[PDB]
Coordinates of C-alpha atoms and ligand atoms in Angstrom, one line a residue:
Chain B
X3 CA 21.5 -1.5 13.3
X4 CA 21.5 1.6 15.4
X5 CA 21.9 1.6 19.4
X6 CA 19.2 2.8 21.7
X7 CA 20.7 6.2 22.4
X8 CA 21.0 6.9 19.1
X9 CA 17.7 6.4 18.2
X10 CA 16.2 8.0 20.9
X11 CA 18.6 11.0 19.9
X12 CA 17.5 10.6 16.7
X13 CA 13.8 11.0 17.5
X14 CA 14.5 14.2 19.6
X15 CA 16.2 15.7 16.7
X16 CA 13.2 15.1 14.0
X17 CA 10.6 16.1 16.6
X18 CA 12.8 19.2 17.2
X19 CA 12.5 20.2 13.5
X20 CA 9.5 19.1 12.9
X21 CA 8.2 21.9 15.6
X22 CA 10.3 24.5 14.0
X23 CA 9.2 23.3 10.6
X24 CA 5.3 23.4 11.0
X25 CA 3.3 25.9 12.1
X26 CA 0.5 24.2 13.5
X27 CA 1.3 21.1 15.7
X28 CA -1.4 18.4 16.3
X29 CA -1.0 19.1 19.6
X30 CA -2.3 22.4 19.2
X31 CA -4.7 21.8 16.5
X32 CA -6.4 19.1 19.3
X33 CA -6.3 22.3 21.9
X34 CA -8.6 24.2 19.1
X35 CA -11.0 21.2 18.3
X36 CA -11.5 20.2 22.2
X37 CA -12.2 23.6 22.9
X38 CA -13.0 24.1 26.8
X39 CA -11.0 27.4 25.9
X40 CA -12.7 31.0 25.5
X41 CA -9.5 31.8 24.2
X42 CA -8.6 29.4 20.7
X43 CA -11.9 29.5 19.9
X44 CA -12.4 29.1 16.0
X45 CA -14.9 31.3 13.8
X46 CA -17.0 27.8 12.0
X47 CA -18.0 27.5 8.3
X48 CA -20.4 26.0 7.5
X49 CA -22.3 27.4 4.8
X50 CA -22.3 30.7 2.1
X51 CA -23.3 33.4 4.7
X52 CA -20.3 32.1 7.9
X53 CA -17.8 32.0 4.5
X54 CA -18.6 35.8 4.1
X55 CA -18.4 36.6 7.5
X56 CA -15.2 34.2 7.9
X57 CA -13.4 36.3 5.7
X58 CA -13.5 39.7 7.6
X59 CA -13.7 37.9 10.9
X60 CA -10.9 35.9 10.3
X61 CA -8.9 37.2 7.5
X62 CA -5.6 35.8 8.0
X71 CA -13.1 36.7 -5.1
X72 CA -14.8 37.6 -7.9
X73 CA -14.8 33.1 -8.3
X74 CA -17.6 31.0 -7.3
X75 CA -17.4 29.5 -4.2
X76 CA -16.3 25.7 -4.8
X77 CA -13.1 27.3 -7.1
X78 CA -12.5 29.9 -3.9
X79 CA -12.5 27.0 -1.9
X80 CA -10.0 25.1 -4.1
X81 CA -7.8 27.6 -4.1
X82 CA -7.6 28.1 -0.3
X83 CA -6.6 24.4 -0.1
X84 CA -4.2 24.5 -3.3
X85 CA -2.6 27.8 -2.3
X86 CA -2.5 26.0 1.7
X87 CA -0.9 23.0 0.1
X88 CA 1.7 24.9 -1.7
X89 CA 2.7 26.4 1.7
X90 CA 2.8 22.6 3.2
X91 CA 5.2 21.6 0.3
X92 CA 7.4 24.3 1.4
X93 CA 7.3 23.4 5.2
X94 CA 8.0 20.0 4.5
X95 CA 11.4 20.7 1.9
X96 CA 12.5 22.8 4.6
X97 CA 12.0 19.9 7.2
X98 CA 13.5 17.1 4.8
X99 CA 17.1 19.2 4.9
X100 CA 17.3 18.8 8.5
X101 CA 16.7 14.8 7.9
X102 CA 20.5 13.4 8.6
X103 CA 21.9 12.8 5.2
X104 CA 19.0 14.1 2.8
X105 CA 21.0 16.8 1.6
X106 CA 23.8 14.8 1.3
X107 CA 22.0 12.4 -1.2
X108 CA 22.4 13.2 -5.1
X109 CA 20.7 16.2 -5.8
X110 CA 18.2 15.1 -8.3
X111 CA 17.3 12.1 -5.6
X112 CA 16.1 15.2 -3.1
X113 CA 14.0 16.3 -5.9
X114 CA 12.3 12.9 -6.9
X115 CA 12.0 11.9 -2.8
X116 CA 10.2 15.0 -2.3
X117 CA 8.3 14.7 -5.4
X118 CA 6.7 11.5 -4.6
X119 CA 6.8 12.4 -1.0
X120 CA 5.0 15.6 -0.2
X121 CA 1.4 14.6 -0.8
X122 CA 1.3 11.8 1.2
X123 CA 2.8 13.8 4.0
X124 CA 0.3 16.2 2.8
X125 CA -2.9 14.1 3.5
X126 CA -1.1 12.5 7.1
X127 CA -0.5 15.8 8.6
X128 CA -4.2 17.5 7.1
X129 CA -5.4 14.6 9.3
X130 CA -3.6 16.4 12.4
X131 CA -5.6 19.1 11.6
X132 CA -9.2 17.1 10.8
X133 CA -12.1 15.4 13.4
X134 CA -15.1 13.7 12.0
X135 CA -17.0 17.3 11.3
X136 CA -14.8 19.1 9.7
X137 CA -10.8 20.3 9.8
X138 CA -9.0 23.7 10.6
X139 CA -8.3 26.6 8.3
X140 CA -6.3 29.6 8.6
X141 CA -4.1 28.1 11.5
X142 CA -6.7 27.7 13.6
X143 CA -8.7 30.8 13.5
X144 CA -11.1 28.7 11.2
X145 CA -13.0 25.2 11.0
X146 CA -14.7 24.9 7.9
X147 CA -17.4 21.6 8.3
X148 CA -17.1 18.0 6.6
X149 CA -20.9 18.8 5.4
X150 CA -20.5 22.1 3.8
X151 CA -17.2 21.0 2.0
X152 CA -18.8 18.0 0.9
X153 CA -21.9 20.0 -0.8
X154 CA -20.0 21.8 -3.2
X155 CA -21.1 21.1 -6.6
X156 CA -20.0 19.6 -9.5
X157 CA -16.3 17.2 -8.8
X158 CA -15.6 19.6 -5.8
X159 CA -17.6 18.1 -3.0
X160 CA -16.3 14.3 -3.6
X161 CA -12.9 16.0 -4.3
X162 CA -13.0 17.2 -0.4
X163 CA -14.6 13.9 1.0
X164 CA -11.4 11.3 0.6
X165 CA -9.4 13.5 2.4
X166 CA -11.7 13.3 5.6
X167 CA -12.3 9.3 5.4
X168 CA -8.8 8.9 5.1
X169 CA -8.0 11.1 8.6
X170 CA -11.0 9.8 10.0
X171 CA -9.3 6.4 9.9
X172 CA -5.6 7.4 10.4
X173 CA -6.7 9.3 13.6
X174 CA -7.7 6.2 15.2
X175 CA -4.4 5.2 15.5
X176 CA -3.8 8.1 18.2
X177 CA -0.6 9.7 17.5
X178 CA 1.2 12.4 18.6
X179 CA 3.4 15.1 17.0
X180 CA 6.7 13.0 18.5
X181 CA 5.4 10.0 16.4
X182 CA 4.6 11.8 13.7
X183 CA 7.6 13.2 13.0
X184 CA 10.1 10.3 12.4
X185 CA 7.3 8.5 10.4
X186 CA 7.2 11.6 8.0
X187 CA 10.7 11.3 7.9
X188 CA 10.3 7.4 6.8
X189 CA 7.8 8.2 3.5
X190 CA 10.6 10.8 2.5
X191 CA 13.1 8.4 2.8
X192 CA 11.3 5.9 0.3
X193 CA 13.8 3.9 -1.9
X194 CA 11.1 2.7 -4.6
X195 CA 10.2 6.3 -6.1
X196 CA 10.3 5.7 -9.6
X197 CA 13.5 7.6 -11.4
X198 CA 15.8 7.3 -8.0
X199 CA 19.5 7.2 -9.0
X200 CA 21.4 6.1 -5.8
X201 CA 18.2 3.2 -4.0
X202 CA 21.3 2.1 -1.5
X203 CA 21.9 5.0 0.5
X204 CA 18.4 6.2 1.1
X205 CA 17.1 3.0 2.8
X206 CA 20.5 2.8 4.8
X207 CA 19.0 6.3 6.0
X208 CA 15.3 5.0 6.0
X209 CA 16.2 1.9 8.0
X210 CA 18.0 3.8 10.6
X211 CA 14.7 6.3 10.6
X212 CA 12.5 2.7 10.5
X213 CA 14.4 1.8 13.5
X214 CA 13.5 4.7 14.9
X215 CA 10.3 4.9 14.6
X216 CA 10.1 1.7 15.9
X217 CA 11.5 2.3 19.3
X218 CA 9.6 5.5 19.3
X219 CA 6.2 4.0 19.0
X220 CA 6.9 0.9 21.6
X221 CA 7.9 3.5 23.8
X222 CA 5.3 6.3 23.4
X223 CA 2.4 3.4 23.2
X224 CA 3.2 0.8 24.8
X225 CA -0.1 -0.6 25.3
X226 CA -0.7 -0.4 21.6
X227 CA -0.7 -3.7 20.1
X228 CA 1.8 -3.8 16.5
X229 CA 1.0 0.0 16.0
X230 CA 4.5 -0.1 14.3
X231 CA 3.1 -2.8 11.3
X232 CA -0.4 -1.2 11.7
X233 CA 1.4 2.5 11.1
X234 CA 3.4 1.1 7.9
X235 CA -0.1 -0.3 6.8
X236 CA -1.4 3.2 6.6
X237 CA 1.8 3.8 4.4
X238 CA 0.4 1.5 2.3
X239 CA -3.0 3.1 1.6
X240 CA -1.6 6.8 1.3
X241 CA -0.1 5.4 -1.6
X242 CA -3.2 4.5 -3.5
X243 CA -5.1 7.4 -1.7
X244 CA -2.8 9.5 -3.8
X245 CA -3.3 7.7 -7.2
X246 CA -7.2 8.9 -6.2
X247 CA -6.5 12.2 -5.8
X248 CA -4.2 13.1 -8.5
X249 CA -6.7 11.6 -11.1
X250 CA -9.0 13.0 -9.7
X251 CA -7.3 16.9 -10.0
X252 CA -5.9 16.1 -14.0
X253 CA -10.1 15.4 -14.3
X254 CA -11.2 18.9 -12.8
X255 CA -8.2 20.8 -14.2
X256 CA -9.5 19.6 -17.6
X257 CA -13.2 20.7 -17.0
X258 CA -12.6 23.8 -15.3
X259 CA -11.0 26.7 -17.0
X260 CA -10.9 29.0 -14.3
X261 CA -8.7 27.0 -11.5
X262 CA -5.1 27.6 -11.6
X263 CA -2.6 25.6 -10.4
X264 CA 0.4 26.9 -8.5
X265 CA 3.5 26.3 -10.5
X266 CA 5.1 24.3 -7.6
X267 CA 2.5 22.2 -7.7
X268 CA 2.2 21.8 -11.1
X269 CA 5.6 20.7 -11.8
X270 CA 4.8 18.3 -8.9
X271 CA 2.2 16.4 -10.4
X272 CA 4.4 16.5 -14.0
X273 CA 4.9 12.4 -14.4
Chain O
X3 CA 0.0 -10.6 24.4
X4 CA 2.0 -13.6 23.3
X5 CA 5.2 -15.5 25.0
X6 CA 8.0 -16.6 22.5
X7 CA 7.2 -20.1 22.9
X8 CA 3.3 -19.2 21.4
X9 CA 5.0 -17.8 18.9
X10 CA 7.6 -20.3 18.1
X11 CA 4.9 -22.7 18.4
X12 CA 2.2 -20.7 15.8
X13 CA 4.8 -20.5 13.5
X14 CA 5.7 -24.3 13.0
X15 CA 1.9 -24.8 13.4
X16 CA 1.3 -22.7 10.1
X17 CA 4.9 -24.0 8.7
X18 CA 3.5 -27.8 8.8
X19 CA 0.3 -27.1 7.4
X20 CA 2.0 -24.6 4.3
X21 CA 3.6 -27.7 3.4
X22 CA 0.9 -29.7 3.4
X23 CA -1.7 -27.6 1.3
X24 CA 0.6 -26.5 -1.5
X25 CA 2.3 -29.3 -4.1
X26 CA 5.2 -27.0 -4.6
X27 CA 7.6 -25.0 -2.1
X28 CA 9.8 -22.2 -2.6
X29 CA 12.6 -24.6 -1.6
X30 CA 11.6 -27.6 -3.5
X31 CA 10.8 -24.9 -6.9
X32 CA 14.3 -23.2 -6.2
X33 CA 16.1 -26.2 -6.5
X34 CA 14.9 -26.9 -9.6
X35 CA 14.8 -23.1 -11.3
X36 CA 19.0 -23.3 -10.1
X37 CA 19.7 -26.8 -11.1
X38 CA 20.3 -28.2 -8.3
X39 CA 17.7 -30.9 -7.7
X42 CA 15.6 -34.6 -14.4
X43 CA 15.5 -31.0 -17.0
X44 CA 11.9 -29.2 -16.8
X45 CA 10.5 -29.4 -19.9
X46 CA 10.9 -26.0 -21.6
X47 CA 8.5 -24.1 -23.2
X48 CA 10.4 -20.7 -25.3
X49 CA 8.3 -20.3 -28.4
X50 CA 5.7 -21.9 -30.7
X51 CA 7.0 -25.1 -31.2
X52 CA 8.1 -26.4 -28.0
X53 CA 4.9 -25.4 -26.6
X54 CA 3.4 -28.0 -29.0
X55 CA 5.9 -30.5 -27.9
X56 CA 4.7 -29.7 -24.4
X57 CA 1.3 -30.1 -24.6
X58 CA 1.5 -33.2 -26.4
X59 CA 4.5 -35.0 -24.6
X60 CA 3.8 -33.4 -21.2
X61 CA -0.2 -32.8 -21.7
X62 CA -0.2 -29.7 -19.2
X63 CA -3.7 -29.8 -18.0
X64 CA -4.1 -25.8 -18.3
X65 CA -3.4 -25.6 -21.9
X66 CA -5.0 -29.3 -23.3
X73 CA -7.7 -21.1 -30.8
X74 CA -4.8 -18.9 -30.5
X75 CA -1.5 -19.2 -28.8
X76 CA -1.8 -16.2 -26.5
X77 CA -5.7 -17.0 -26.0
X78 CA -4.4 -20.9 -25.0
X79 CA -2.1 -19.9 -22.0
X80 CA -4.0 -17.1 -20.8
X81 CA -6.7 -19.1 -19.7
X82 CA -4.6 -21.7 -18.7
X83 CA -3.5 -19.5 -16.1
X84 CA -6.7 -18.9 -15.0
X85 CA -7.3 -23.0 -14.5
X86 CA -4.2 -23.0 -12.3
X87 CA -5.4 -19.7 -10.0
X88 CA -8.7 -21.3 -9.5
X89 CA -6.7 -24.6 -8.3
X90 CA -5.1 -22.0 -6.1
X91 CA -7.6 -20.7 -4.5
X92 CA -8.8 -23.8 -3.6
X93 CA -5.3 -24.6 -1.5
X94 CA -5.1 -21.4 -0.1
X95 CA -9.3 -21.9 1.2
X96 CA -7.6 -25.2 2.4
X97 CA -4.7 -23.8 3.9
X98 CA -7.1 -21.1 5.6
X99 CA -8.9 -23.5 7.8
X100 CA -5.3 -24.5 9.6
X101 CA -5.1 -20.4 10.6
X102 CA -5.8 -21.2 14.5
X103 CA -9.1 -18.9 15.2
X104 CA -10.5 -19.1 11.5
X105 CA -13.0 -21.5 11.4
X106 CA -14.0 -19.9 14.4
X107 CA -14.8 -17.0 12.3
X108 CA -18.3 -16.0 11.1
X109 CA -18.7 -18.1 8.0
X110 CA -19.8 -14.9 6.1
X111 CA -16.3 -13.3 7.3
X112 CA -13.7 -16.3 6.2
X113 CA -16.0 -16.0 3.0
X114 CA -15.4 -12.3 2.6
X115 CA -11.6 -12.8 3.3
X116 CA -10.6 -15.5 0.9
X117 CA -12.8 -13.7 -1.6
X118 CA -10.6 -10.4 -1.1
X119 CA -7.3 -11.9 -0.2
X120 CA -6.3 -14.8 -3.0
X121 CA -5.4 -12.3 -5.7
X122 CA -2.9 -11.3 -3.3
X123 CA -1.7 -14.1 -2.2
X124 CA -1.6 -15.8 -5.6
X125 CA 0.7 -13.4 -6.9
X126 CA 2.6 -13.7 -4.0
X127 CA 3.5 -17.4 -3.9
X128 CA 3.8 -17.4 -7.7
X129 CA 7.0 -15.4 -6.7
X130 CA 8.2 -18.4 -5.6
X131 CA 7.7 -20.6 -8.9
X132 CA 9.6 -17.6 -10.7
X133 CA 13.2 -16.0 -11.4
X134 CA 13.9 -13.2 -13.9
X135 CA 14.1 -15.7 -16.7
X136 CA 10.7 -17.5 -16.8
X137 CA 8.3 -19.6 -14.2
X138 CA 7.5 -22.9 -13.1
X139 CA 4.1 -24.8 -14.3
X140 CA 2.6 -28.2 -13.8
X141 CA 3.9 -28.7 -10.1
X142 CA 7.9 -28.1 -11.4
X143 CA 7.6 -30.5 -14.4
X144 CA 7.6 -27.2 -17.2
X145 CA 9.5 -24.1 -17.6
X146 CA 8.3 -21.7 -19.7
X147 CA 10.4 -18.6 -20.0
X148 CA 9.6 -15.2 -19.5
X149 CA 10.6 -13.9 -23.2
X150 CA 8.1 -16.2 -24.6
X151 CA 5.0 -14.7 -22.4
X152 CA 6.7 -11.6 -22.7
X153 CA 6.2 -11.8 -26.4
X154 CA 2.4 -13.1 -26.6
X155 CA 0.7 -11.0 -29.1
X156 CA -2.1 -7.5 -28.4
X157 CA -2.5 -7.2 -24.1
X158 CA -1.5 -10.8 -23.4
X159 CA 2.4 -10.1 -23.9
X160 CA 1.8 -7.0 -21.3
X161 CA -0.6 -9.3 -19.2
X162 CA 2.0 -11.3 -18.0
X163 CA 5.1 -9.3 -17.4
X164 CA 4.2 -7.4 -15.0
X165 CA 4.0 -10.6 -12.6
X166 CA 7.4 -11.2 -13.6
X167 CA 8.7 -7.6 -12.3
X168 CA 6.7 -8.0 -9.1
X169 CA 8.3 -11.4 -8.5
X170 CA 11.6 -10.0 -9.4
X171 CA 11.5 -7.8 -6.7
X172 CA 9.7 -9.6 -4.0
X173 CA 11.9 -12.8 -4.1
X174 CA 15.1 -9.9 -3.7
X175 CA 13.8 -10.5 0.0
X176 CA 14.7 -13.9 0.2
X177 CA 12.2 -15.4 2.2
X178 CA 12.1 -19.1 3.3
X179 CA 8.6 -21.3 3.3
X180 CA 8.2 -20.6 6.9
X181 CA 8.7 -17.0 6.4
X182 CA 6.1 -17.4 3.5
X183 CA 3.3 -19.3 5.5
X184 CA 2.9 -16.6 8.4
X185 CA 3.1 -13.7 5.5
X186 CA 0.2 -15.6 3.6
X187 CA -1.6 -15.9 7.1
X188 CA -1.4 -12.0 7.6
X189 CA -2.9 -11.3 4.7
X190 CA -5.9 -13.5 4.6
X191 CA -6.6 -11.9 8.3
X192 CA -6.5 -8.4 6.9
X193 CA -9.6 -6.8 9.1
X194 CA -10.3 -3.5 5.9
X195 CA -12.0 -6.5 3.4
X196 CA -15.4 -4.6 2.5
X197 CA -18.1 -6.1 4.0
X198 CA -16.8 -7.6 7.1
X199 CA -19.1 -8.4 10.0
X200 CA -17.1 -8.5 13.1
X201 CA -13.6 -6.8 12.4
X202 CA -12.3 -7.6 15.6
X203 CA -11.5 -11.3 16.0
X204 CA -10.1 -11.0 12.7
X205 CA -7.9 -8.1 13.8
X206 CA -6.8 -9.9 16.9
X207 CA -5.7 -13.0 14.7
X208 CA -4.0 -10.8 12.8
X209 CA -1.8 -9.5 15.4
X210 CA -1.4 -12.1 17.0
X211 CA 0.2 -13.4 13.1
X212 CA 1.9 -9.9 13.0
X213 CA 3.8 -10.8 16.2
X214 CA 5.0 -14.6 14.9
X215 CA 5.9 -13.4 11.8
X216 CA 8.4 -10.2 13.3
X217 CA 10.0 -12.7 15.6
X218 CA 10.3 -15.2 12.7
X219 CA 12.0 -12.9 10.5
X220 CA 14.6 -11.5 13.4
X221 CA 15.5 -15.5 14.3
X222 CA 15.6 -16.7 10.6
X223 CA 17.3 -13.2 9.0
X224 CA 19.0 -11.7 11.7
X225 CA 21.3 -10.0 9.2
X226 CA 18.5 -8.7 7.3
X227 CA 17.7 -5.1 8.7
X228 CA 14.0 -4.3 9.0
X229 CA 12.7 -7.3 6.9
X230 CA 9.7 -6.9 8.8
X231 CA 9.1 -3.6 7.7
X232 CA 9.7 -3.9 4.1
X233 CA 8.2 -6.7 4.2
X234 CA 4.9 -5.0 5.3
X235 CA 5.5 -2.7 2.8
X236 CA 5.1 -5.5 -0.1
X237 CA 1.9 -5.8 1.2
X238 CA 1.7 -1.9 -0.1
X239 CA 2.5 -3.1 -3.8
X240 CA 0.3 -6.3 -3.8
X241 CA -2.8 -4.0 -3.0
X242 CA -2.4 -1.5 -6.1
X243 CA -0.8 -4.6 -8.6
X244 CA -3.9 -6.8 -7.9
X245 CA -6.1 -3.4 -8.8
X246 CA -4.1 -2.8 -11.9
X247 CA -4.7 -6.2 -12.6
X248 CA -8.4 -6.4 -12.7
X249 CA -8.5 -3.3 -14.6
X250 CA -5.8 -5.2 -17.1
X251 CA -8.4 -8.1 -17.0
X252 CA -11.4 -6.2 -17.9
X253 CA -9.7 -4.5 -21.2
X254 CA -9.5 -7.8 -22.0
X255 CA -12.6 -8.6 -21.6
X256 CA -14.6 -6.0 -23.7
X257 CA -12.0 -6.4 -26.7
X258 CA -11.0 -9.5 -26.5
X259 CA -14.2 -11.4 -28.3
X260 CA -12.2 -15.1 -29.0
X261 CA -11.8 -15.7 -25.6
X262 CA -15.4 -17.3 -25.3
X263 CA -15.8 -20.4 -23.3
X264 CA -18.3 -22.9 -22.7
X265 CA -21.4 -21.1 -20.5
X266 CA -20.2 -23.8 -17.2
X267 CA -16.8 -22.6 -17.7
X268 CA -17.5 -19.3 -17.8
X269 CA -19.1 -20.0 -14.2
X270 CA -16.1 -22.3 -13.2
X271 CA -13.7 -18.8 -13.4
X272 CA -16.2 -16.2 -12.9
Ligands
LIG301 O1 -2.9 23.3 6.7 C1 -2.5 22.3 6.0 O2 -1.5 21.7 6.2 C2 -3.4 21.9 4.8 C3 -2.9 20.9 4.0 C4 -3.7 20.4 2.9 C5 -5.0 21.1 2.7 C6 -5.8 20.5 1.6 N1 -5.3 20.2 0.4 N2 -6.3 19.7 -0.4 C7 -6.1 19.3 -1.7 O3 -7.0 19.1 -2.4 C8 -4.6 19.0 -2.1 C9 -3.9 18.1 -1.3 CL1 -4.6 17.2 0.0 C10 -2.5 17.9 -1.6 C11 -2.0 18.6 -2.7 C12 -2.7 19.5 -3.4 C13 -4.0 19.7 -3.1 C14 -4.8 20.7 -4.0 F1 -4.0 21.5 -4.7 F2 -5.6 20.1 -4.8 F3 -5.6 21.5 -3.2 C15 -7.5 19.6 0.4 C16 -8.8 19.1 0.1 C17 -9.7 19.1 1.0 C18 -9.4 19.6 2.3 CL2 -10.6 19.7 3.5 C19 -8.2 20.1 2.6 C20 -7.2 20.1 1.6 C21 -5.4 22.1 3.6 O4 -6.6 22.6 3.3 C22 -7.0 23.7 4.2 C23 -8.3 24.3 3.7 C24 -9.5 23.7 3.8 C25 -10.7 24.3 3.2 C26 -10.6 25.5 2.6 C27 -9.4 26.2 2.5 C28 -8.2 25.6 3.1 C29 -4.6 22.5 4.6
LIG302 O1 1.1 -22.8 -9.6 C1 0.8 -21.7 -9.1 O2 0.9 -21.4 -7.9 C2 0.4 -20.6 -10.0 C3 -0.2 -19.4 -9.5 C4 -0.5 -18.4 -10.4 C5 -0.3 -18.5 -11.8 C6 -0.6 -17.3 -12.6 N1 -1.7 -16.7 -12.4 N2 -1.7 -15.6 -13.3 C7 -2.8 -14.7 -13.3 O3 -3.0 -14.0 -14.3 C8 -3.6 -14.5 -12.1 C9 -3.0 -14.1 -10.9 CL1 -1.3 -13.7 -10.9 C10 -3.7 -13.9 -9.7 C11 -5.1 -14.2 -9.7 C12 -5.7 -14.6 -10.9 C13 -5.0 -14.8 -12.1 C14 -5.8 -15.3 -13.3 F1 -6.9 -15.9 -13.0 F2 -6.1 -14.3 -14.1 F3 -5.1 -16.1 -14.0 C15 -0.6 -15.6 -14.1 C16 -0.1 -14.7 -15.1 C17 1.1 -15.0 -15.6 C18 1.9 -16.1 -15.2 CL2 3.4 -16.4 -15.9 C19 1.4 -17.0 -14.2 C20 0.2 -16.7 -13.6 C21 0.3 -19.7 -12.3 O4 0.5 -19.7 -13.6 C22 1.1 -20.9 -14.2 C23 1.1 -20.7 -15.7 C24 2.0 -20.0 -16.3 C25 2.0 -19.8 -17.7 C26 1.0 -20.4 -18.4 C27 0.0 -21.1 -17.8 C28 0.0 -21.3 -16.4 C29 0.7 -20.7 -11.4

């Protein structure tokens, strides 16, 4: 049990890194999809002749689409594991735990922070690319052939879904914090001291969300409720990547990720 | 929303009728699995499951050993289901439901709640049957011969770790309650209503758990995050259920049984 003005200190703190750890904040990624602004416009995909111009309008091969597609999201998600490691450190005591408890917390972690921050980046139609300068559609992702287009789909039923629950990047940063801090990972040496951390970040979050939405009826059990899915949502999609990876020769998989997805 | 006293008042509402719909409590099946209440009879291998059956005359095993007490604990779970349908109807706002809806969320939400109160009839050594009268231990189903053996531990490792929490009956009757009132069941007519019980369950059961565990930081929360495991272990076990079915040819039953615990 934690005092008031520590957790609100707390949630400044997480929110703090959490802006200096990810490039594109919800906030911002709501800016681009509302539009009303000559300014953030993005370029939209949403079929084979916008990809082609996408990719000298917006910038930042010789593959067919649905694999150059695949790896855009691979390569993106490596990028997110690294965002996310970095954010873990400043989480008070992470690096403190036993070092092979880091490894296994963000092993198990990273893609279901993965899938609750793509949301951040997703509507109904379609979700952001190339931070911001892009919005590839729900339609054309899902019409890629063979296991790619219901590969894509999940991702967008689960945002769709997790949206509704209307929160902001100041929420979304202590409850990031929570999945890390996760005492049942299979393999975890030392359970005690990470849900002493995890209840002070449960806490948290908590007072956060009473606070931030106070009309919002038991967001708190119905945000830990979405904690639950993510967890299956994940079983889903890792199946679902050892099945392609199998069929398709020519998709590589990032090293990083690969080791990921190891047991 | 709610005042404390609604609260207070829902949860001794639910308490009363948990009591009444289900022939053995966590406290009354505690007492017994400590030896602190007349022995169980014990069932721990072949021949004291003879005994058993023929002393004792449990009603879910009256073929082949492992075959025997599988589907005897399918007689019990479809006993189950009935208290828990029963125990359902004392939710305040369920029969108020659609009838298509309360159908739709006991069809969806016994398999969880099964395993959870069988929690209760177990320790890390084996599991209460016939309403607290038998004990058969977990080595012994552990043991059971091709998938069976693997069949039943894993309810032993869920219970393990569930009853680490410590809750009470009256925790347990508003936990039960949030579950059957879980608004995602497929097929669903009118979400809402069932959402608003739920929340309104959500909100006795957090105030229940601070007032009966006060020393027991974020219950609530890890509570809710059982209800995480119970989803993917009642998935795993259907799957476990279906291997069975498809290689498992000696586990034919009468046509009307079949329909019984279809
Ligand atoms: O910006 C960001 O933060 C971001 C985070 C995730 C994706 C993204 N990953 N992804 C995966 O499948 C995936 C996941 Cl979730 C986790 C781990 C590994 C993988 C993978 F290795 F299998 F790749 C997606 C599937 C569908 C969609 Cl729509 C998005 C993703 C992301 O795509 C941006 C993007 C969309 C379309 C074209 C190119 C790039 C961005
Ligand atoms: O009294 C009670 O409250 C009670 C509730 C459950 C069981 C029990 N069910 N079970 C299942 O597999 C199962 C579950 Cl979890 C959920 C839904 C459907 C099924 C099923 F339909 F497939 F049956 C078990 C597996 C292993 C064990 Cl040890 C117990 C159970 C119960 O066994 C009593 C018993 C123990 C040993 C032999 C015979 C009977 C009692």
């Amino acid at each position: 049990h934690m005092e008031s003005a520590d957790l609100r200190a707390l949630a400044k703190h997480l929110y703090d890194s959490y802006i200096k750890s990810f490039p594109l904040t919800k906030a911002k990624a709501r800016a681009i999809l509302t539009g009303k602004t000559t300014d953030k416009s993005p370029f939209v995909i949403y079929d084979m002749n916008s990809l082609m111009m996408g990719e000298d309008k917006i910038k930042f091969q010789s593959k067919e689409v649905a694999i150059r597609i695949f790896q855009g999201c691979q390569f993106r998600s490596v990028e997110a594991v690294q965002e996310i490691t970095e954010y873990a450190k400043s989480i008070p005591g992470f690096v403190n735990l036993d070092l092979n408890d880091q490894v296994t917390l963000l092993k198990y972690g990273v893609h279901e922070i993965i899938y609750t921050m793509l949301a951040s980046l997703m509507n109904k139609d379609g979700v952001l690319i190339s931070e911001g300068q892009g919005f590839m559609t729900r339609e054309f992702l899902k019409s890629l052939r063979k296991p790619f287009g219901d590969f894509m789909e999940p991702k967008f039923e689960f945002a769709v879904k997790f949206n509704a629950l209307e929160l902001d990047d100041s929420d979304l940063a202590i409850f990031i914090a929570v999945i890390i801090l996760s005492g049942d990972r299979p393999g975890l040496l030392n359970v005690k001291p990470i849900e002493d951390i995890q209840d002070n970040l449960l806490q948290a979050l908590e007072l956060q969300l009473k606070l931030n939405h106070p009309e919002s009826s038991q967001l708190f059990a119905k945000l830990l409720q979405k904690m639950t899915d993510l967890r299956q949502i994940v079983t889903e999609h890792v199946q679902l990547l050892q099945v392609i990876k199998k069929t398709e020769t020519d998709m590589s998989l990032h090293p990083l990720l690969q080791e990921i997805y190891k047991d």
